[PDB]
Amino acid sequence: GTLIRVTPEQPTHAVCVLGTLTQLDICSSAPTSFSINASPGVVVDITWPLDPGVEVTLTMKAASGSTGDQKVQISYYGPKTPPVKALLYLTAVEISLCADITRTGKQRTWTWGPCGQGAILLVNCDRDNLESSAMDCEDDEVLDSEDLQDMSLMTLSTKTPKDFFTNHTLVLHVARSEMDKVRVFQATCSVVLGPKWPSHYLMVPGGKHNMDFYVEALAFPDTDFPGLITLTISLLDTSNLELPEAVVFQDSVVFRVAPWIMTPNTQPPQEVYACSIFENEDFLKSVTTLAMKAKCKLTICPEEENMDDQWMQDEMEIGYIQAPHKTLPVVFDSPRNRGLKEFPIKRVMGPDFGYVTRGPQTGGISGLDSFGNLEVSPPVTVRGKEYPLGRILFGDSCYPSNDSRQMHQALQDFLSAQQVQAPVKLYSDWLSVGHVDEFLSFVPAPDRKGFRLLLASPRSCYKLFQEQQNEGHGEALLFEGKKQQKIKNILSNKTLREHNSFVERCIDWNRELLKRELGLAESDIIDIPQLFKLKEFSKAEAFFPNMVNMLVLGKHLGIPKPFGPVINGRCCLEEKVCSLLEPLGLQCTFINDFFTYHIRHGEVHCGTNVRRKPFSFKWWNMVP
Amino acid sequence: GTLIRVTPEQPTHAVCVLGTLTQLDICSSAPTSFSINASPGVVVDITWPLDPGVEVTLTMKAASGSTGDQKVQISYYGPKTPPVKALLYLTAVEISLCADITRTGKQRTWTWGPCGQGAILLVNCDRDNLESSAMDCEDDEVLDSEDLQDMSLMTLSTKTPKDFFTNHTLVLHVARSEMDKVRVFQATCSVVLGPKWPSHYLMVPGGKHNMDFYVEALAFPDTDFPGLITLTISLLDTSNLELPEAVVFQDSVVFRVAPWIMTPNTQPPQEVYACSIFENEDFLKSVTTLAMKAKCKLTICPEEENMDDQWMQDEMEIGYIQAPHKTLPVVFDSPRNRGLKEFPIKRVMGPDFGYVTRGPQTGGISGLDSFGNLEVSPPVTVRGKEYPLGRILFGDSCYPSNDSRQMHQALQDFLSAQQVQAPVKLYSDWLSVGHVDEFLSFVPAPDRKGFRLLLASPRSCYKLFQEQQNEGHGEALLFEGKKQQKIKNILSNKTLREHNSFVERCIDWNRELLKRELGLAESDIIDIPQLFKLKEFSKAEAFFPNMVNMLVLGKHLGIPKPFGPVINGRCCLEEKVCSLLEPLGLQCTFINDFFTYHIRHGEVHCGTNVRRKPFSFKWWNMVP
Numbered sequence A, B: 001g002t003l004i005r006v007t008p009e010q011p012t013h014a015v016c017v018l019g020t021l022t023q024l025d026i027c028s029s030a031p032t033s034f035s036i037n038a039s040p041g042v043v044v045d046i047t048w049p050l051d052p053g054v055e056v057t058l059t060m061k062a063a064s065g066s067t068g069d070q071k072v073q074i075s076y077y078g079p080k081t082p083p084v085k086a087l088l089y090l091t092a093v094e095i096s097l098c099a100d101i102t103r104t105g106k107q108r109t110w111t112w113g114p115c116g117q118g119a120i121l122l123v124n125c126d127r128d129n130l131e132s133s134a135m136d137c138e139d140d141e142v143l144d145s146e147d148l149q150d151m152s153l154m155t156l157s158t159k160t161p162k163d164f165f166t167n168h169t170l171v172l173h174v175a176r177s178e179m180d181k182v183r184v185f186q187a188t189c190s191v192v193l194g195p196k197w198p199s200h201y202l203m204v205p206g207g208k209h210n211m212d213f214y215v216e217a218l219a220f221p222d223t224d225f226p227g228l229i230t231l232t233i234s235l236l237d238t239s240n241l242e243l244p245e246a247v248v249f250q251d252s253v254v255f256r257v258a259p260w261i262m263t264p265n266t267q268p269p270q271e272v273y274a275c276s277i278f279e280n281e282d283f284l285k286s287v288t289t290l291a292m293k294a295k296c297k298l299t300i301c302p303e304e305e306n307m308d309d310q311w312m313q314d315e316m317e318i319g320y321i322q323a324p325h326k327t328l329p330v331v332f333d334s335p336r337n338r339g340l341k342e343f344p345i346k347r348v349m350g351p352d353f354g355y356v357t358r359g360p361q362t363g364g365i366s367g368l369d370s371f372g373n374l375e376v377s378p379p380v381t382v383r384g385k386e387y388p389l390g391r392i393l394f395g396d397s398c399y400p401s402n403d404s405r406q407m408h409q410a411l412q413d414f415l416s417a418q419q420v421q422a423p424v425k426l427y428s429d430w431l432s433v434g435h436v437d438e439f440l441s442f443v444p445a446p447d448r449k450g451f452r453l454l455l456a457s458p459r460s461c462y463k464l465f466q467e468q469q470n471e472g473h474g475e476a477l478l479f480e481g482k483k484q485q486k487i488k489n490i491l492s493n494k495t496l497r498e499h500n501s502f503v504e505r506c507i508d509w510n511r512e513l514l515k516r517e518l519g520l521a522e523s524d525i526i527d528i529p530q531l532f533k534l535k536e537f538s539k540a541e542a543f544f545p546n547m548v549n550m551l552v553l554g555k556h557l558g559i560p561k562p563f564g565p566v567i568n569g570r571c572c573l574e575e576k577v578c579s580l581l582e583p584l585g586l587q588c589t590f591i592n593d594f595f596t597y598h599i600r601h602g603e604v605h606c607g608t609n610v611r612r613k614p615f616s617f618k619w620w621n622m623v624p
């Protein structure tokens, strides 16, 4: 809106911006009746009576060529009076601040969805600079023209009379609350807005001009940042030299900072990671083969950088950030800060590879803070609400006690603040190590919802063993090929069966948690045979290598080698698992991980990581 | 949900909680065809074939009298087989956690609105304890039974067999993220949940029992607290003595903490405040009269406690918090921390009087942080969105610069986090002092929307003076009854008219800001005649006492005495204002505030404060 106020005691000079509703105050200094005659470029909606209800409104069709080149004449006449005249001289200008608010690569509110509106900003948290230790956004400089591709275009367009900025100035600003979270460079780079600076006078020439800005974000959405940054242009009248500058017009663009998004096992793999370790050459060769079959590059951290840390699942999680103009992978580096600590910083973070961390870095850290305790489900629809990018899953206790553990609050808050994968707290504190990958995986399926949840299941392993004893193989030896144990003795062991009944309860609680939060039906779930035992603090560990803890590379599964009882040439555990999964068109390979991984309380999934293809569905089309 | 898993190789013992969907796993250990026969208290939905699609579901009608007193028999028969039988013994219990979730005084999601759902918690931030300096909630103790009335009732009801808690235990908990924000006392007080303690074992006897808890909140909604606290009961199986406790059932109540809410001038007054100061007796007498006419108690801070601080509008804002069971007023104490600093702490905070503060208390403080720069509009509906408790208004600059000021971020965030009065940033930085009460007030009206916005208006004062000169009074003296000035000289003064044109722009910008954000139409607005002048840093001060800066006590207005030009016995400024407002049925009194207040850059509204009647509309029925 804008009130132009007119008098007959003087002519008034005003500016109108195209797209704005200007209104005329005719009554406040009038002296009955009035008529309005305006130049041709000024259209007036509304031989008229001076009732204070009288709405007079002015609209311009085009930018002025010169100052005051449009004109409105208001005359106040009546019953026996010749006219008193009030003059108004207008200058019309275009001032459009544009960004990719339709989300194609190109209100001031941001809206979610396919019919929604608002531009997107990436946190510029990768490292396109050769030989540097810090993220691109840690400084107020654009060093490589490659770096501009990560940034979002914003354009100011002006159409004015040549002499217009003799008396007006334009300023760009961000609220002080948000200046720490955005940086803005003016294009022909040097910064115009940023953490040191919430506003800047633009240097624009009269006539027809177009000025490009490049915007990056410096922070992901989090507890104290919902994730919107508004940038505003204000047109100032600076024509009286004594008086302060007067604002004539503001306009704004609202951006939303892209969340950090995980990729489930159902997304096709692109790159694999693991460590080289002492006597581990045959584990590493086995993964290499599997990668080849699934078409993945492969990367190994060596014994020098490892610091003898083998658990490549735990220190990091590879995600992505996504904007219409640019999608890039970003690593979320766990505060667990073990031997693998540096590997996210030096080796993964890089050209088109983002970085992020959270949590206390000098410690105050559970094991539930390791990223074997961070998964995502596949996409899933739950009582009519779509989670098209899946729902994040992480382990916890059922309630908080003195003895209980949790993933650190700052990570919990970060994941939720991401919004787009509405986390779900599962129960994993019953496990010694405490990770959800210890009792669940997800695999692609050619039918139903296009996946299956695999849950570890003692019951199924009791059933198998019983079905083998029933068919005469009670003398068969677990751990054939450590102390061997026979199926008749495993089965009759009453205390082992109590432990496994209690693990069964823990897994079952989660089965139903996943059935409700994730929309699953029993035909979405397969049980993998798996025995556990309780050890220190009645916490659970795998009795034999945890098969459900597997590397999923599309259809090629790297499953820990259970070394089960060998019947008619084969491990019955291997055969049972193949019978459960081959009908889905999965290919099971069984990798020896026993003295290398299993005895140190982890398996194949725990010894490795995977980068996968980001979802084709665009996060901003969700309506969380 | 819950899977009971049955075998024919053993009978199983399970518990069912009333209101829960129990399901039976018949296939996992079956050995074709099955039938189900259950005791009379167990109803089974579902002479049946063993297809793994077969859904079997169990529902109980009532609490068990003894353990295992209901019974399910599953038999697996077939083509030539007599039955193998699997037994299941059930015990049914009631475990209901109840609170005032319908909001009358009496899903686990909280919902806004008249058809919404969820209990309400008050921050227990008043001081019902005699002789104490701290808020009730600063400690983990309930000292007065009066204090319980501020708290929210929550009840656990159990119906079990007598011997039930021999093998089960109940625990109450809050997530660790929220334990710093709630405290929970068990009733016959001593705490069961709180900032030191996120869980507690309840001591409940078998049979029919009912246990009351009293809940208070320790924190208002704010940037890092959306304002929901969930409390959960979990039923644990503790019958195997080696094994960890197993969760059998959780249920929860979600509370929402009440926001802090302001009251506009359109709400009827209840109590008035001001200071006793040096030569100010006649200001104080004038307010006293006005209070009496409007039926308000009256309170004065004396020269001893003042520390010579006269600005009773600035240090505090009296609001309220509201819950079905209890509504109480709460003072929001400004960080400006001037001479009035202690007055909120010692004199206002008290029995059924809450307290809150925000911002850096040792300074880093603008003048825009004073609470003359905090107002609320009346209730208002804006393009179809209702703000039934009004919208908070506070002053700012138009953009951020080196020289510009703002209300401190922590207050800004606090007000927004309150949600229910969606703040609006107005432009007041152009004023020397910098407060929105310097250019706007609101008054009750008997028509239209039931109020008017009054805006300071130089134009209207130029018009009046011109209309008086026109009728021959150019020689009339402003400041009659300091150096006097005549209407002909005020009018011809060209530099005074430039200042006032520039103030006109500043007020006009806000007029349209309020027209859009607040839904107003011109017939909602009255202009009060008011001249300003520009002084240090071209910042604006009142040329004569700022009339729009008035005390509104229902229909009785305490307006600063302008001491205008006296024409036919009367100040024309007084007469113009009376002509604008008497037709609304307002009663204007003009209070001398000139050497006492006006020359120290403030007026009557600035010398005073008011507590008013909280809205009848309940904040939780809004849908922000």
Ligand SMILES: *CC(=N)NCCC[C@H](NC(=O)c1ccccc1C(=O)O)C(N)=O
Binding pocket: A309, A310, A311, A313, A314, A367, A370, A371, A372, A373, A433, A435, A437, A438, A549, A599, A600, A601, A602, A603, A605, A606
């Ligand atoms: C599935 C998963 N994410 N597993 C990670 C579990 C492995 C580590 N293990 C150890 O720290 C460990 C245990 C015994 C002996 C040596 C070591 C070691 O390599 O330091 C864990 N428990 O977090």
Ligand SMILES: *CC(=N)NCCC[C@H](NC(=O)c1ccccc1C(=O)O)C(N)=O
Binding pocket: B309, B310, B311, B313, B314, B367, B370, B371, B372, B373, B433, B435, B437, B438, B549, B599, B600, B601, B602, B603, B605, B606
């Ligand atoms: C309308 C409103 N909220 N006004 C408050 C403005 C008053 C104070 N004034 C002073 O601090 C002041 C100015 C000059 C001489 C003495 C004093 C004084 O009492 O300390 C303000 N400017 O904030």
Ligand SMILES: [Ca+2]
Binding pocket: A136, A137, A138, A139, A140, A141, A142, A143
């Ligand atoms: Ca940079």
Ligand SMILES: [Ca+2]
Binding pocket: A124, A125, A126, A127, A128, A136, A146, A147, A150
């Ligand atoms: Ca970059």
Ligand SMILES: [Ca+2]
Binding pocket: A315, A333, A334, A335, A336, A337, A338, A341
């Ligand atoms: Ca780390």
Ligand SMILES: [Ca+2]
Binding pocket: A126, A127, A128, A146, A147, A150, A351, A352, A353
């Ligand atoms: Ca890049």
Ligand SMILES: [Ca+2]
Binding pocket: A313, A317, A371, A372, A373, A374, A375
């Ligand atoms: Ca993971």
Ligand SMILES: [Ca+2]
Binding pocket: B136, B137, B138, B139, B140, B141, B142, B143
């Ligand atoms: Ca207390």
Ligand SMILES: [Ca+2]
Binding pocket: B124, B125, B126, B127, B128, B136, B146, B147, B150
């Ligand atoms: Ca109390």
Ligand SMILES: [Ca+2]
Binding pocket: B315, B333, B334, B335, B336, B337, B338, B341
């Ligand atoms: Ca204070």
Ligand SMILES: [Ca+2]
Binding pocket: B126, B127, B128, B146, B147, B150, B351, B352, B353
């Ligand atoms: Ca009280």
Ligand SMILES: [Ca+2]
Binding pocket: B313, B317, B371, B372, B373, B374, B375
């Ligand atoms: Ca106020």
